[PDB]
Each structure stands twice: as structure tokens, then as C-alpha cells.
């Protein structure tokens, strides 16, 4: 872990580390576990420097929380875009008076969550329309500031 | 549709053709004045170096233009870069010097 | 003629001391200054170390940028080179030595 | 620091959200969070944007085991020993 006394947490992150010194309910357990499943389990093939872009590890945690963050991951990943797409977008919006270019190097761990479904935007804008609620005050600016 | 794709890992940078071919900064190109004007900075930055000491030659299409002369003594070294450097650098989407 | 013209000279030397100048590959670099000073300081008696301008190897994709050189060897001489990016998995751009 | 914005790695401040640059003139324009204290020549991003990306370097667990009634019992083994060194026993 980060910070000082990283080795302080090992004892809690990996049960199997403590041997089986005495005869205790705790040890009876540790004795029951398998040695080989602890620490780093599998890692990414791609890497920057001598560090891997991602890794799979065994360690204390709870299936629920893990499972949640699992879906949260997915959801974001699905929202990915790549600069090339941005080039097309901004350029097309301009109606052809300028042309945008977004240079970039090759990478797969470049997260840019911005893509969504029209459905979502509609739902969202219905909320906006309801917000007005006949209060000129809310519109007054939009119209003016645009003019 | 001309655009430029930077070089990487030693490779050369390349600008896009008019037919969609991408060439390196060398050879004989043809630029309509306007095209440069609308990108003075970016171009001067990317090409000047190759024009001066490299192997790139550009033909800017102008049609008509005002000119100014600078005479020199033939027996002594004379390099016109400083003169043309200024020209290129002072080109704008609104002006050009003699 | 050597600098901006098309004259290239091979100086026969036999053996000679050399000196290295490493530079960042992704930035302009013109070795004329060094190779000038070398020529300038040759003498019926002296001859300073030959200066070479070499690129810094890299363990990752990098942009490229022009580099003007004037002095190269005529046979392998980088034998003193022990290892590039020694602490990394592999060299992506530039001289790769294991 | 800058080139990092293109993917090229360290061979700009994270404060940057938008880095624009024109080709016909020398006048770049960058956007920063309106919540910053140094709008020095920087443009702003007013939108009330949600923080999606967040990181946790800790443990991915939400349950913790606690002691309700303490206790201390005698044991045959008191610690691990190596040459002259001796490490204590830490249970999970």
C-alpha cells in the first residue's frame, strides 16, 4: 500500500503469511488454506517503464464491494471515445470553416468517458424543460446572453 | 483537406496531399497563397527548417504581387535567407509584404 | 559549400580521439557549430577531439524532429556502448543495445 | 510535462481540461475548473460537472472484523527467530 509501514498491512492482507506457530482456532484456519494463492496473480502484457498497465491480485476484500466496482468500471469503459472521434465531431460542428486535429500516440489505457445515448440526453432535457416552470427569470438570461 | 500528422519514433512527419496521399517534408510542392496565409504560424514552424537547410521547395501561387530589389556585390558571399525568412514569417491571413 | 552546398569531404585519419554530445531527439538540433569549431581549430600541430552528436535512446514512443549533422564515422565505433535504457523492458526509439 | 497531453510520456498542469491552439496566430486557449483560485490567463469551465473518475489505493473491502471481548492467553510459541533477529507473530 502507499505511505509508511506498508509491511504493517501485509499481516491483514494475506492470512497465509502468519505461519501455524501455535495450536489455535486461528491457526487451524491458516493451516486449512492453500499456500499458492496470494499476492500478484496475473499481470498486463503492456507496460510503461517497468510497471504493468494493470494487474490481478489476491488480497483481503469483499465480493460485494468488488463486484460493484466491477460494474462501475464497465459502465465508464463503455463511455469511451478516442481523439480521432473528437476530430470528426468538432470539425463537423464548425460547418466547414475550420478543421480540428487532435494528435495522439498509441495507447489502450487512455480513458475518455463522454459517449452516451440520445435517449439519455432526451430524458435529461425533459428535466431541464420542467425546471423552467413558467418562471421567466429562468429563461430571461439564456435568450438575452445569446443575442 | 490538407492536415499534418506528426512523426514518431524517428519516422518522418507528413502532410496530406490533395488526393489524400501523405508525403514527407521534401520535394516540389504547390501552395496557393491563401492556404499558407490561413496557417502562417503552424507552417512557418513546421516547414521553414526544411526549406532552409533541407531539400524542400515550394511554389506559392499568387498571380500578381509587388516586388522589391536588393542588389549585392558578386565577389562577396551573400545569403538571402534572412530576407526571405522575414517575408514568410510576416505573412498573415490579411497581409503580405513586398 | 560544406554547410549549405553539396560538398562532402572524407578526411583520412587512421585513428582519432572522439567526444560525444548527446541531444534530445524530439527537438531541433544543428551540429554546425561544433563541426565548425573543429575545422576552425585544426593546426599543423593540433587537432581537437572529433565531436559527434548522438541521440538519446528512449524506452517509449516519442515525437520526432529534424536534426542536422555534419560528422559521421566510416565504420563501427560505438563499441564502448554498454546498454541503453538498462532499467526498462526495451528500447523503442534510438540506438538499442543490450 | 506538456507532451503528456498527447500520450507521449515524460521523457501543462492536470488543472487543464481543454488545450486549444490556432494555426494562423499565436494565441493558445486553455480551460480550467471554475473552482480554482488562479484564473491566471486561463479560461473557465463553468458547467456543474460530476466527478466520475476516482481512485482507491487502499483495500477493496467494506466489512471489518472487530473484537467485542478481549482476551490474552499463554502460548507455546512466542515469536519467529532468524540468527540473532526475532520477529513477532502478527495474526490476520
Amino acid at each position: 500500500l502507499p505511505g509508511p509501514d506498508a509491511e504493517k498491512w501485509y499481516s491483514i492482507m494475506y492470512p497465509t503469511r502468519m505461519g501455524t506457530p501455535n495450536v489455535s482456532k486461528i491457526c487451524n484456519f491458516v493451516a486449512s488454506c492453500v499456500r499458492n494463492r496470494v499476492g500478484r496473480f496475473d499481470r498486463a502484457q503492456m507496460m510503461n517503464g517497468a510497471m504493468s498497465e494493470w494487474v490481478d491480485v489476491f488480497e483481503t476484500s469483499d465480493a460485494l464491494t468488488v463486484s460493484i466496482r466491477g460494474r462501475w468500471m464497465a459502465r465508464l469503459a463503455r463511455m469511451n471515445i478516442n481523439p480521432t472521434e473528437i476530430e470528426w465531431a468538432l470539425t463537423e460542428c464548425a460547418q466547414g470553416y475550420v478543421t480540428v486535429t487532435s494528435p495522439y500516440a498509441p495507447s489502450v489505457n487512455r480513458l475518455m468517458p463522454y459517449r452516451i445515448s440520445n435517449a439519455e440526453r432526451q430524458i435529461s432535457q425533459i428535466i431541464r424543460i420542467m425546471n423552467i416552470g413558467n418562471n421567466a427569470t429562468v429563461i430571461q438570461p439564456v435568450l438575452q446572453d445569446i443575442s | 483537406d490538407c492536415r499534418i500528422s506528426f512523426g514518431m519514433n524517428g519516422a518522418a512527419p507528413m502532410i496530406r496531399d490533395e488526393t489524400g496521399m501523405m508525403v514527407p517534408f521534401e520535394g516540389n510542392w504547390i501552395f496557393p497563397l491563401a492556404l499558407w496565409q490561413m496557417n502562417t504560424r503552424y507552417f512557418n514552424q513546421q516547414f521553414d527548417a526544411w526549406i532552409k537547410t533541407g531539400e524542400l521547395r515550394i511554389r506559392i501561387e499568387m498571380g500578381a504581387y509587388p516586388y522589391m530589389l536588393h542588389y549585392y556585390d558578386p565577389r562577396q558571399y551573400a545569403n538571402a535567407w534572412n530576407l526571405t525568412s522575414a517575408w514568410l514569417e510576416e505573412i498573415t491571413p490579411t497581409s503580405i509584404p513586398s | 559549400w560544406i554547410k549549405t552546398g553539396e560538398l562532402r569531404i572524407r578526411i583520412e585519419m587512421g585513428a582519432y580521439p572522439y567526444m560525444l554530445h548527446y541531444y534530445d531527439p524530439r527537438q531541433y538540433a544543428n551540429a554546425w557549430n561544433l563541426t565548425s569549431a573543429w575545422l576552425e581549430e585544426i593546426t599543423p600541430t593540433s587537432i581537437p577531439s572529433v565531436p559527434f552528436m548522438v541521440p538519446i535512446s528512449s524506452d517509449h514512443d516519442i515525437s520526432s524532429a529534424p536534426a542536422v549533422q555534419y560528422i559521421i564515422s566510416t565504420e563501427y565505433n560505438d563499441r564502448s556502448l554498454f546498454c541503453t535504457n538498462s532499467s526498462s523492458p526495451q528500447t523503442i526509439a534510438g540506438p538499442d543495445k543490450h | 510535462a506538456h507532451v503528456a497531453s498527447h500520450g507521449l510520456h515524460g521523457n501543462e498542469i492536470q488543472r487543464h481540461i481543454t488545450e486549444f491552439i490556432s494555426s494562423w496566430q499565436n494565441h493558445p486557449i486553455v480551460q480550467v475548473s471554475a473552482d480554482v483560485e488562479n484564473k491566471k490567463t486561463a479560461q473557465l469551465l463553468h458547467a456543474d460537472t460530476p466527478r466520475l473518475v476516482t481512485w482507491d489505493a487502499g483495500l477493496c473491502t467494506s466489512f471489518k472484523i472487530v473484537p467485542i471481548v478481549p482476551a490474552q492467553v499463554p502460548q507455546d510459541v512466542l515469536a519467529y527467530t532468524f540468527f540473532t533477529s526475532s520477529y513477532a507473530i502478527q495474526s490476520p
Binding site: - | 512557418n44 513546421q46 516547414f47 | - | -
Partner: peptide, 23 residues
Amino acid sequence: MKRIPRKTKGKSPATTEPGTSNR
């Protein structure tokens, strides 16, 4: 570790390049 403060309240060799001259 880094830290991003909340905006809300919670539960609590010549190098002089040939084209860089400003005009």
C-alpha cells in the same frame, strides 16, 4: 496518494529552431 478537494459539503548543439521567431 494525491488529493482533490471537494467543491461541496458532504455527509460530514544549436537549438534555435528556424521558424519560431514571433511576427
